[PDB]
Design a protein around this ligand. Structure first.
Ligand code: HEM
Ligand code: HEM
Ligand code: HEM
Ligand code: HEM
Lengths: 146, 141, 141, 146
């Protein structure tokens, strides 16, 4: 993944407007609704029986905050995504057994959420920049999988 | 399979698109060319610059095809038969690209339908575009 | 769609496989775990070493499911229905992985069918495993 | 992607037995049979109407020889695949307009051809090494696409 300087600026500028807890809960919720097999990691999270139950689930929201918080922090290191997420890559492979395809699905949902949230401000060039970012983060989180 | 609720959701959401269908089709294509540049390998004969008549025209054809599919959601294989033929026998676009355009259509819809793009509608639209893609690649081999 | 030639090709190939089906299923899984390490995430409870009795037992079950699918090649959704339920709602294997196992099953068949694995049979088997994969993921959402 | 020293040895050992001309024609022929939409790039190649016609087609065999010849050359260069295929990457993007998905498909078919030709010798570890290789070559050839 290689963003141009203007793309990095674009990412940073839009993200400055993001409520990370809110977008994190929304993205993880939509992940579990749109791609319900991803629920397999969250049997301990309680009621996931309907879309409203998933989106409103406080444990879903809490993990959403956690995941997107780490995502957000990683945006400070667009020049070292592999290195920035290496220890989380190890954890997800070694202990959590999370198929890295889950990271790609979440990236796709995140892009949809950003488009929904920002509307026309999420221009085709801004989207392209964010596609590079979510691909790069997913690739970084997948790197340690042996 | 597309459930009754999927069909209801798609009809309602695409109904709202209405007269903007062609515009949104063009925007989805532009988003695709920028986000997934390998897809440009299928359009070397196009001016792909922003606002081109070719991309606007093609956007309208893609959008109208989707309107056809929405209108005949109970039997899309027959509704899209000529189009399935065209892609399988002539255009021969690799099936992986249908997911790319579908994601870009979904993003375009999310950006224009703030009220309608709920998690349930999101899911239904994703299923619908995947179903259309399946029909359009059903005759490839 | 599987053509009558496809179905003929699949039955011929799987018939030559015969009693080795289980052994080949285990081999395909082993190939999968080495070639595509992310697939190992679904088996943290297995010893995945070469010759593992757990991999051998799972390979037998996968192979038997395929034998049953071949025996019901015209009626595959019902034959595989319980497995469609199981993968959709319990195992919840990401759909992307079925292509990986299908490739490894093809490679395994190639390595054991010097005479039978013609280009035509190759194509038919690829279509068949894609069809099985489609059925197995049909209830995911 | 980076290969282990032992993966490199397995790749090199098997390739010493590969008739690059013959395997090349076989792999390209099977690509056109198994994924017939790939024939879109070979309109001028003559008769592709049946499997036997595809496999026996002299232009298919000649091109297969050319393509796998370049593949073969790259195997001397496993730590620098991106640099090795940079010129051909640009060519396929700029002039030939070839979707890089085709490189992944050919990779899959080549692995099947090696398994078919070599049988038991094409062990699960040897296959795993060759999967890294065809993925790396596909990625190297896709790299210049903008
Ligand atoms: C941008 C992508 C992601 C990032 C940055 C991320 C980050 C994190 C972080 C920081 C933790 C906490 C680690 C710890 O406490 O030591 C975690 C745990 C976890 N993650 Fe990920 N994650 C991502 C995507 C996903 C996805 C898509 C899934 C599954 C669908 C997932 C499943 C889990 C699970 C099951 C845990 C353990 C949660 C717990 O113990 O409460 N992650 N992740
Ligand atoms: C996914 C939903 C898709 C729909 C509904 C769709 C629909 C259409 C329609 C209606 C046409 C015009 C047919 C005619 O003029 O008779 C067309 C042509 C075409 N499509 Fe598709 N298509 C889809 C996917 C794709 C994808 C993913 C690609 C490649 C990335 C693609 C590449 C093309 C090309 C190159 C043409 C010819 C353009 C021209 O020369 O005017 N299509 N498509
Ligand atoms: C042709 C494709 C496939 C077939 C025919 C198939 C068939 C089966 C069968 C027959 C079982 C045993 C069911 C039972 O005991 O009730 C099973 C279980 C299982 N499958 Fe699938 N499967 C396929 C693809 C996959 C893939 C691609 C994965 C993951 C990479 C996978 C992961 C699993 C797992 C983790 C189990 C449970 C194993 C255990 O804990 O014993 N399957 N499958
Ligand atoms: C994956 C490894 C591949 C390698 C190493 C490779 C290499 C080459 C080379 C060396 C040439 C000759 C270029 C010249 O003389 O200037 C060529 C031409 C070409 N390649 Fe590739 N190729 C690969 C895959 C593919 C695939 C999978 C396709 C399409 C399915 C493809 C489509 C073409 C076409 C259409 C030409 C021009 C043929 C003509 O003259 O009509 N290539 N390639």
């Amino acid at each position: 993944v290689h963003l141009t300087p203007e793309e990095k600026s674009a990412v940073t500028a839009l993200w400055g407007k993001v409520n990370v807890d809110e977008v994190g809960g929304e993205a993880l919720g939509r992940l579990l609704v749109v791609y319900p097999w991803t629920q397999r990691f969250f049997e301990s999270f309680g009621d996931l029986s309907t879309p409203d139950a998933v989106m409103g689930n406080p444990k879903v929201k809490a993990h959403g905050k956690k995941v997107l918080g780490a995502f957000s922090d990683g945006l400070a290191h667009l020049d070292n995504l592999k290195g920035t997420f290496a220890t989380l890559s190890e954890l997800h492979c070694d202990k959590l057994h999370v198929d890295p395809e889950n990271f790609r699905l979440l990236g796709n949902v995140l892009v949809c959420v950003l488009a929904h949230h920002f509307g026309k401000e999420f221009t085709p060039p801004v989207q392209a920049a964010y596609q590079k970012v979510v691909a790069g983060v997913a690739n970084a989180l997948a790197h340690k999988y042996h | 399979v597309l459930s009754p609720a999927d069909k209801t959701n798609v009809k309602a959401a695409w109904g709202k698109v209405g007269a903007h269908a062609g515009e949104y089709g063009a925007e989805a294509l532009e988003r695709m060319f920028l986000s997934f540049p390998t897809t440009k390998t299928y359009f070397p004969h196009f001016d792909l610059s922003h606002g081109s008549a070719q991309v606007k025209g093609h956007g309208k054809k893609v959008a109208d095809a989707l309107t056809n599919a929405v209108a005949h959601v109970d039997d899309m294989p027959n509704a899209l038969s000529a189009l399935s033929d065209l892609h399988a026998h002539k255009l021969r676009v690799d099936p992986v690209n249908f997911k790319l355009l579908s994601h870009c259509l979904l993003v375009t819809l999310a950006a224009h339908l703030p009220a309608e793009f709920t998690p349930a509608v999101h899911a239904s639209l994703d299923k619908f575009l995947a179903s259309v893609s399946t029909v359009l690649t059903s005759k490839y081999r």
